[PDB]
Amino acid sequence: NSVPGAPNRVSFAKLREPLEVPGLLDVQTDSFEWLIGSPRWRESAAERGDVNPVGGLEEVLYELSPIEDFSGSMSLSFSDPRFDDVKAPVDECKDKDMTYAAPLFVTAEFINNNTGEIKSQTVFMGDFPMMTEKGTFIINGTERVVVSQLVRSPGVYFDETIDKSTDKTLHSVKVIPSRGAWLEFDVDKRDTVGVRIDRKRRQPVTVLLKALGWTSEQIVERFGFSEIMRSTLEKDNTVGTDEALLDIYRKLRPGEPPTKESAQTLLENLFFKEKRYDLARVGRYKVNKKLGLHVGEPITSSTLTEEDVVATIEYLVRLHEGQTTMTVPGGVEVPVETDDIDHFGNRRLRTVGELIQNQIRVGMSRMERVVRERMTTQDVEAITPQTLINIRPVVAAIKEFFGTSQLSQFMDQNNPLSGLTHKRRLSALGPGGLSRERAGLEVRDVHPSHYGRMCPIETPEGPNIGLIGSLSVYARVNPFGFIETPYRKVVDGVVSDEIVYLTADEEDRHVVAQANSPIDADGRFVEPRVLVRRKAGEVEYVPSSEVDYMDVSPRQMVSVATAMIPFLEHDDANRALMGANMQRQAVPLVRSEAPLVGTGMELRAAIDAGDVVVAEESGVIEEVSADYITVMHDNGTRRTYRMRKFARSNHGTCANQCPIVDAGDRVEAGQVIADGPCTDDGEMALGKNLLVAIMPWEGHNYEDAIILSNRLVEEDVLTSIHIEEHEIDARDTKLGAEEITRDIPNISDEVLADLDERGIVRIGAEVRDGDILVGKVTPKGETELTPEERLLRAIFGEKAREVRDTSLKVPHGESGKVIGIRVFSREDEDELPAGVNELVRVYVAQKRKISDGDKLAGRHGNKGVIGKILPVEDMPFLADGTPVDIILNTHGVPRRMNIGQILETHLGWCAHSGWKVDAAKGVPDWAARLPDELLEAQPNAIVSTPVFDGAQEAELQGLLSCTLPNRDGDVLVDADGKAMLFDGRSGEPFPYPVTVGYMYIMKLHHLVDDKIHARSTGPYSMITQQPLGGKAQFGGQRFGEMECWAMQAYGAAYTLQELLTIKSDDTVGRVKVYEAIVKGENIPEPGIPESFKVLLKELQSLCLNVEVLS
Amino acid sequence: VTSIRIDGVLHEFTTVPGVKEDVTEIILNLKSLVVSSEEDEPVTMYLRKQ
Amino acid sequence: VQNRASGAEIGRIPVDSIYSPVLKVTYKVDATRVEQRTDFDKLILDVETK
RNA sequence: CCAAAAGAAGUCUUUCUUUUGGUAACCAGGAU
Fold first, then answer.
1. Which of C18, C25, C26 lies nearest to residue A714, judging by beta carbons?
2. A78 forms bridges with which residues in the sheet?
3. Which residues of B touch C2 (CB under 8 A)?
């Protein structure tokens, strides 16, 4: 549509969108360039927040500096963070297992406050991992994604909880800071206002107020409008400020002698000295907004103040009093109401920059601790800024973050859509967020403030449902971490084109209409009554004069993955959730095909994911090949694009890239120049178009099972390539000298045929489980001084030749060609982990066809494993001899409420055959509002039905009534959309017509070949002698507690006794039963399991005298 | 056709210098040949291009 | 056919074989059911090869 | 219970004897 070479996909959309879809990877990239402080972010903030532009690093270095000693006779300060160029390109870093990072330098200045001798230096602060142009990090070769975290913003939260004993309303307030100490004010069943500083027992608020320097006269002067505060003051029992300080000291400081100076200083230290208490800028902003204190002054300062505390107490007591609004002296009035903590005005987003800033902050705190401890144990005038700084904790924090965290994860690379979905994810679980096992049902709900900001459909189906969400298409995150959505403001009933981004609170104040409303070509609603959203998400019918805003489009409340489901509004939310979640499990196929009926989101999602090659500058193609494309730019310069051929992804799939241009074509900037894994000419192509029938067939498509044609196996329609990675390295060791070689002890030559002259197998050789990939031997150890042997070694010269082959064998259940071998070595001064001499990596590839038990799926949540694969002759075939490819059961459709698949089938038939609306005498009425150049289409036409503005039922019916014949003038599918099929197995025609069409089905990464496993006997564990677990070792299936209850219920005592003794851990029973079976004898009697004896020994180790009596 | 042998390639998952397609696409294109033989034993046909 | 089953080098690329000449087949029957009960069918079979 | 080496018999490749050699916990992600 707005891409220079996109395919012509004609849309059914009736509406027009004013706003283009933003960059879909803007969250990550605009959050990181704020952290490092790029000029791009500087300009972006200038045209917005020019009042105070500062990056994350500069903020950390400003809050840290200066670092002073108690005497104040010397200080250390930091400034001007600076980055060098990256150490190596992205491709080299990924190939050689190097972290993609850049050096960081700061200017530390040391001042002696009694000699004025200033000493500045440039201090190296470590290597800082840098984000690539696709929103990912490259840590130790692998590609990672940092996920954005949904947390609760810091501020003041008022809530009311009923009381069981008295049936009274009990209000409360919590002042949650960033990295500080809490303090709650509450009204208990008795009419008194308490306080819980830090986390202690309730104390009257009067104690705190007096400790802050308030006389009993001032309190009753300002807080004289409530009976509760007077009641609390009267029964205070505390007179004098010092007494209040002492009481607070008693409560807070356990078992210490109270005094005046310590109590005076500790209270101000806890909440007012900003080294132990911070609110951030978001917290200060939220407190000022809730209480309305400083509307004008800019936010500089992050500590509490007496004004804030007194205002909070007054707000709480007036809320309990039942007031409506409150004005604070020196500040505008505000409404008095309780808070909802699940409101997207109270939940903010910690993006990829905020998290790294927090980690740098703790690292710098540790470093400054070391610095100020080291400033007192070194003699002055020998100190230089380089001898105080210890950079190791800082670099340690970064490593800990990027290696160990629940937000730093391996990038999801099942297919291109998976990674884009991974980068736009908002997870509520992490360090500092709630927990999967401790999350209720009120936080998993879809609050009405999510509209336009978090997609209500796309979320995990398991125990993570509701705790992980995804960002909508048009949403952006503002400077404080709050999500915004564009709205089209309507002035005096005229729908303008001024787009304004509103966060959930502003959207709360106003009244918002709907996108699919009847605009009359002049920005005027046809009727006065339109559905709107009122304050608490209420939906009503307001006359079209109060409306303030309208949505920029439908498809504003959905995310990227959910915007690719055609006919989404005909499917219930339960099945649409599955349809969106199963699109990121599809596996790339050997050849890709774009859907006949899409939604128009595929091109944008494909170009923004980044798996395609896009012309950086316009020019003319000079050379094309399977390996590269050379573009000749309009001005002299040339550029060569290299391709990724058969490269493994994080999940073991193929990552091909092939060109889609010829040697003479001219390309334009931003034009797709080479396809990717799951792209067909620049558009996402996750599956294939299959001819489908919707009948029950002989019980093989029974209960969600599926029937496939054998053509899909012969013609490699659903074939995929899977690649495996195997690693081994040679390490020094204390004994020394690990070696990769062909000379392996106790190995014959027949099992050393595929290996090349120096170990590793040859490229192209097919392997089976157990074959050796890299030959390797290590010292046998047991360095022993046996007289004759040792005296022969020492002077006579007998060699050690102690070897123990730790070779690399291909594990159980694996095979395929050897496509690549990557060998590192210390001889070539390659950067390897310390103590490693050599490192070799072998890639093994398989090509898998579709087979029974493999999982398939559509875009509407119609999953199911393949039940049978019929020969092409015994399948229902059309009157012209065309067999169907897939057969789906009827009983699954009407009960699940996903009728969108039937409409997709009808429109797919119409698109495949091509149509022509006969406007011989006037266009038909059903085709009146149908866009032009949709009145006719050629066979195999690609169309698009946007998610909430697509093809109506009347238009589908009309298109079905007029559809082109195939070769002879025969129309196979009638106006109802059904065809007369023949039974290819018996020969007779089926008595009634059946629904046929084209559906777009996907192959999911749940194949049987990874799921099948069996075991007679094999490896056993060590501590307990039970069999191992897992397919790669061998392992047995687990016979758990529930399966034991089932067998006890049946009454089968002998089966249960043998299963637990002579099949698991009866060490002599195992061998005896094997011998009895092979020799044809009777199975012997079981003994005692070994785990019971292990249990007895552990109990005895706990100093318990366990003994078995007779 | 029962098998092929490209001289410069060792397996199906590689690329030929100068050819716009890769070996997998070449095999998928050859999978559309229609040929008729007259003798039971296998025979070989050659293809050379410069 | 797996490369190991036959005696073949690394350069051999086994290929799936489809020895079917016929492309598409269909039929229709013209049943004449008169009132006097002298009936018969008429098979019209259509064959298309590659 | 398996591998390697040596000796003996026959078969043209098995048997007998001797020597050497022979796993877990965390965190994360999925499925029903």
1. C18
2. A108
3. none
Question: What is d(CA A295, CA A1097) in angstroms, rounded to the nearest whole number?
Answer: 71
Cβ neighbors of A818 (< 8 A, separation 6 or more) are A761, A762, A763, A764, A765, A766, A767, A773, A842, A843, A844, B11
Q: How far apart are the first and last CA of chain A?
A: 87
Q: Count other Cβ atoms within 10 Å, centred on residue A513.
A: 23
Q: Could you identify the residue whose CA is nearest to the C1' atom of nucleotide D2?
A: A746
C-alpha A197/C-alpha A272 separation (Å) is 14
Specify whether the CB–CB gap between A326 and A334 falls below 8 A.
yes
Question: What would the DSSP string read from start to end of A742-795?
Answer: S--TT--SGGGSSEETTEEEPTT--B-TT-EEE-EEEE-------HHHHHIIII
A26-36 and A56-64 are packed helices; what angle lies between their axes, rounded to 10 degrees? 40
Amino acid at B28: L
The answer, yes or no, to whether the previous bond of A254 is cis (omega within 30 of 0) is: no
Question: How do A203-204 and A628-633 pair as beta strands?
Answer: unpaired
DSSP track, A797-844? ------EE---EE--TT--BEEEEEEEEETTTT----TTEEEEEEEEE
Q: How far is the C-alpha of A885 from the C-alpha of A626, rounded, in Å? A: 32
Instruction: Report CA-CA distances (Å) from A413 to A135, A143, A236.
Output: 14, 10, 65
Give the angle subtended at the CA of A547 by the CAs of A543 and A548, to the nearest 5°.
Answer: 165
Taking the C-alpha atoms of residue A469 and residue A349, their distance in angstroms, rounded to an integer, is: 12
Chain B positions in Cβ-Cβ contact with residue A721 (cut-off 8 Å): 13
Judged by DSSP in three states, A291 sits in helix
Q: Which nucleotide is nearest to A804 (CA to C1')?
A: D21
Rounded CA-CA distance A596/A365 in Å is 58
Other C-beta atoms closer than 10 Å to the C-beta of A565 total 26
Residue among B5, B7, B11, B23 with most chain A CBs within 10 A, to mutate: B11
Q: What's the token pair of residue A671?
A: 């034009």
> Would you tell me which residues have their CB within 7 A of strand D?
A 404, 406, 409, 460-462, 464, 581-582, 585, 745-748, 780, 804, 863, 1006, 1019-1023, 1028, 1033
Helix or strand run (H / E) with residue B27: helix B23-30
Resolution (angstroms) stands at 2.9
Pairing of strands A836-848, A817-825: antiparallel
Which DSSP state fits A925?
G
Task: State how far the Cα of A393 lies from the Cα of A365, in Å rounded to an integer.
Answer: 9
SS3 letters across A1006-1060: CCHHHCCCCCCCCCECCCCCCECCCCCCCCCCCCCHHHHHHHHHHCCHHHHHHHH
Which CATH number fits the domain that encloses residue A325?
3.90.1110.10
Asked whether the beta carbons of A188 and A165 are under 8 A apart, the reply is no
A967 φ, ψ (degrees, to nearest 5): -125, -55
Torsion angle of C-alpha atoms A176, A182, A186, A190, degrees rounded to 10 = 160
Q: CA-to-CA distance for A140 and A408, rounded, in angstroms?
A: 13
Range of the domain at A211: 155-335
Q: CB contact, 8 Å: C17 with chain B?
A: yes
